[PDB]
Ligand binder design. Structure first.
Ligand SMILES: Cc1cn([C@H]2CC[C@@H](COP(=O)(O)OP(=O)(O)OP(=O)(O)O)O2)c(=O)[nH]c1=O
Ligand SMILES: [Mg+2]
Ligand code: NA
Length: 319
DNA sequence: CGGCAAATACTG
DNA sequence: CAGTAT
DNA sequence: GCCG
C-alpha cells in the first residue's frame, strides 16, 4: 500500500496513465481487505490484483522491500516538481528535463513559459495548498453577490469537493445558471469585470472572453485582509436545461464521474456536462460514431434513474 | 490484443 | 492538432 | 497494471 503508491505516482508523472490507474486500483483494494495479505494465492484472489501485483506484494510482505522502488529513475522527483506547475503536464516536464532543467530556479531563469505556466509558477506553493471549507464559502459568496448584483435571479452553487462535504478544498468550483432559461447568456463579461473592479480576481488562466459562448472561467482570486493566500477559482455558467447534468459533472468526484459515464457507455448511452443521451452509436474501439438522443433530466435524480442506479448524495460520490 | 476511471473546454 | 485542465 |  504505502510502497505501491510510490510506483503509482512515478508512473503517473511519467505519463503511463493506465498503469498508474492499475496500481491505484490495487492499492485501493488492499486498503479494503478484511485482512492483511498473507499469501500469493490470497493476493491473486482480490479483484484488481493479479500475478504481477501479487508477486510484488509477496515480496514487500517478505523481503520487507520492493526492488522496483529502488530502480525508479532519479528524474521522477524533478518531473513531479515541474508537473505541479499549473499549465505544465508530463510532456512539458519531460521536455524541460531533457533540456537540463532540474529546479524551479532553472525554470524561472531559463525555461520558456506559457502565460498560464508563469502564473502557475508565481503561485507555486499556494496552488499546492488546500483551503479550509469556510474560506471556500467566503469565495462562493463573493462570486454569488457580484452575480446577483446585476441579476438577482441568477443561481450560484459551490460544487466539487465543497458540495461533497469535504473539510478542505483544492479550489472553489462555482456553477452559475438562471431558472428563466435565458438570462445566463453573456453574463461572464459582467461578472468578471465586476470581480476585477473590487480586486478579487488576481490572475486569469482560461477565459475565452472574446467568445460569447464562453462556458468556463479558470482563474486566481484572493480575499481581502491579512493572512490570505491566492486561491484557484473555477466558474462555469450553464443553460438551465443543462443544470442537472452540469451540477452532477461539477460535483464529481472525477473518479465518480468517469465511472458513471463508463456505466452509461455500457448501456449504449453517454453522459456529459451538457446532457445524458441514449441510442448512442460507437465503434469496436469504443469511440462514438453516432450522437443519439438527448434524454430529459430535470434533476440529478433523473440522471441516476435513467441509468438504473440508486440516487447517491454528493458525500456518497467522494471516490 | 486492447479497453479500462469519460467526455468535453481553452490555448496557441 | 497536442497538451493541459475539469 | 488488470482482465476477458
Ligand atoms: C479533475 C476533474 C474534475 N472533474 C469534475 C468533477 C470535479 C469537478 C471539479 O474539479 P476539481 O479538480 O476541483 O475537483 P474537486 O473534487 O473539487 O477536488 P478539489 O477539492 O478541488 O481538489 O470537475 C471531472 O469530471 N474530471 C476531471 O478530470
Ligand atoms: Mg474543486
Ligand atoms: Na501541472
Amino acid at each position: 500500500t504505502e510502497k505501491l503508491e510510490v510506483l503509482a505516482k512515478a508512473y503517473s508523472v511519467q505519463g503511463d496513465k493506465w498503469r498508474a490507474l492499475g496500481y491505484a486500483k490495487a492499492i485501493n483494494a488492499l486498503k479494503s481487505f478484511h485482512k492483511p495479505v498473507t499469501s500469493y494465492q490470497e493476493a491473486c484472489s482480490i479483484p484488481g490484483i493479479g500475478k504481477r501485483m501479487a508477486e510484488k506484494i509477496i515480496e514487500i510482505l517478505e523481503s520487507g522491500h520492493l526492488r522496483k522502488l529502488d530502480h525508479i529513475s532519479e528524474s521522477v522527483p524533478v518531473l513531479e516538481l515541474f508537473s505541479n506547475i499549473w499549465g505544465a503536464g508530463t510532456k512539458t516536464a519531460q521536455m524541460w528535463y531533457q533540456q537540463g532543467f532540474r529546479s524551479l530556479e532553472d525554470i524561472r531563469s531559463q525555461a520558456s513559459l506559457t502565460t498560464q505556466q508563469a502564473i502557475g509558477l508565481k503561485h507555486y506553493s499556494d496552488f499546492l495548498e488546500r483551503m479550509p471549507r469556510e474560506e471556500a464559502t467566503e469565495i462562493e459568496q463573493t462570486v454569488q453577490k457580484a452575480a446577483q448584483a446585476f441579476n438577482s435571479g441568477l443561481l450560484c452553487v459551490a460544487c466539487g469537493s465543497y458540495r461533497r462535504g469535504k473539510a478542505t478544498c483544492g479550489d472553489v468550483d462555482v456553477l452559475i445558471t438562471h431558472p428563466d432559461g435565458r438570462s445566463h447568456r453573456g453574463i461572464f463579461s459582467r461578472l468578471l469585470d465586476s470581480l476585477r473592479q473590487e480586486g478579487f480576481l488576481t490572475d486569469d488562466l482560461v477565459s475565452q472572453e472574446e467568445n460569447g459562448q464562453q462556458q468556463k472561467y479558470l482563474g486566481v482570486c484572493r480575499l481581502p485582509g491579512p493572512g490570505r493566500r491566492h486561491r484557484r477559482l473555477d466558474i462555469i455558467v450553464v443553460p438551465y436545461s443543462e443544470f442537472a447534468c452540469a451540477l452532477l459533472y461539477f460535483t464529481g468526484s472525477a473518479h465518480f464521474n468517469r465511472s458513471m459515464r463508463a456505466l452509461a457507455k455500457t448501456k449504449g448511452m453517454s453522459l456529459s456536462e451538457h446532457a445524458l443521451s441514449t441510442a448512442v452509436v460507437r465503434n469496436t474501439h469504443g469511440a462514438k460514431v453516432g450522437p443519439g438522443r438527448v434524454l430529459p433530466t430535470p434533476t440529478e435524480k433523473d440522471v441516476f434513474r435513467l441509468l438504473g442506479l440508486p440516487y447517491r448524495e454528493p458525500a456518497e460520490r467522494d471516490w
